[PDB]
Amino acid sequence: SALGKLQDVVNQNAQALNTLVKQLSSNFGAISSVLNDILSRLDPPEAEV
Amino acid sequence: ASVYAWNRKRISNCVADYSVLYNSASFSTFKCYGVSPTKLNDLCFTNVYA
Amino acid sequence: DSFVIRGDEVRQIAPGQTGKIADYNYKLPDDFTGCVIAWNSNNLDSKVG
Structure with a gap:
């Protein structure tokens, strides 16, 4: 635990990046979290929503 | 069958063409909700029940 | 833009509609104003007769 400060900075940056990556798997109330699925399933009027 | 005893037929292991449904004018109501009617021919499915 | 259609086909003359005459006879844009x-x-x- 001697080098705890640098490891903390690295961990916080990597964890922020991982959280940002994981946020792509949320659909936020949409039918799917994948854009390709929505585009290949719906017409533009509802796919737009 | 009647509405209280609606018949559920499982669709599986077939190649389905939805053009014969969309292009026919006999259907008074042809509404798809979670999917576009014209995109059905480009999709692969299971758990299909009528 | 004037034309004659059936009584049940009036719902298809609207933005974002799907139908028979909506595809092969008369189409409106998704962003239709008017x-x-x-x-x-x-x-x-x-x-x-």
Whole structure:
């Protein structure tokens, strides 16, 4: 635990990046979290929503 | 069958063409909700029940 | 833009619609600004024969 400060900075940056990556798997109330699925399933009027 | 005893037929292991449904004018109501009617021919499915 | 259609096909003359005449006869854009007028003309566009 001697080098705890640098490891903390690295961990916080990597964890922020991982959280940002994981946020792509949320659909936020949409039918799917994948854009390709929505585009290949719906017409533009509802796919737009 | 009647509405209280609606018949559920499982669709599986077939190649389905939805053009014969969309292009026919006999259907008074042809509404798809979670999917576009014209995109059905480009999709692969299971758990299909009528 | 004037034309004659059936009584049940009036719902297809609207933005973001799907139908038979909505595809092969008369199509409106998704961002359509403007609006439609419809009325019954059974006394003028109908014949017994």
